[PDB]
Amino acid sequence: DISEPPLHDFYCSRLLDLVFLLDGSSRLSEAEFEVLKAFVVDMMERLRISQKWVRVAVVEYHDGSHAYIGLKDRKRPSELRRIASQVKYAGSQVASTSEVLKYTLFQIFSKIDRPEASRIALLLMASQEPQRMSRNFVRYVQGLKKKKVIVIPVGIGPHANLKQIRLIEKQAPENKAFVLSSVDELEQQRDEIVSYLCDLAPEAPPPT
């Protein structure tokens, strides 16, 4: 048995597949990226991570996607959390949201092996990709919408692609956006994001 107790009282114990998508561009500095990663880690601590409960995936995106954690990774919650805090600061000139939403659609939820859990993609955005890479953007968002993958856009700062954030929101009612001024505000909103997100997932049927 490779699992461990909750570190906290506030904890999400529902059937959920949660994907954390981290902006890897230079819009976030090394120090700010560390705050992003720490936000990801404390979100994780308040999750009952397990193949039968909450599964997590962590993808840092830039030109392409660098996935550090996959949903099926059978590792203990603590190791997963460590991998997340060790995520490498890329500082790219380009962090493509289209290309990372494409990865979630065709690579993470290619086909639903867990139709009993809600699918949620937490898009942490600090920038805007060049217009030329945004051609299929709405298509990828409509694609995840059909597979019932909820995209919760978290805009961080002035450079965040608010136009895309607004497009995501209107594709489906649950795609709630969280616009923040900087990574320093993440902590102040964390519990509210986990509650919203947890509340969306199905509860496990009464232990029988």
From Swiss-Prot:
Glycosylation: residue positions: S3, T208
Disulfides per UniProt: C12-C198
Top-rank taxon, per record: Eukaryota
Domain VWFA: start-end pairs: 17-193
Residue runs in coiled coils: none
Annotated protein name in UniProt: von Willebrand factor
Species: Homo sapiens (Human)
Shown part of the complete sequence: 1261 to 1468 of 2813
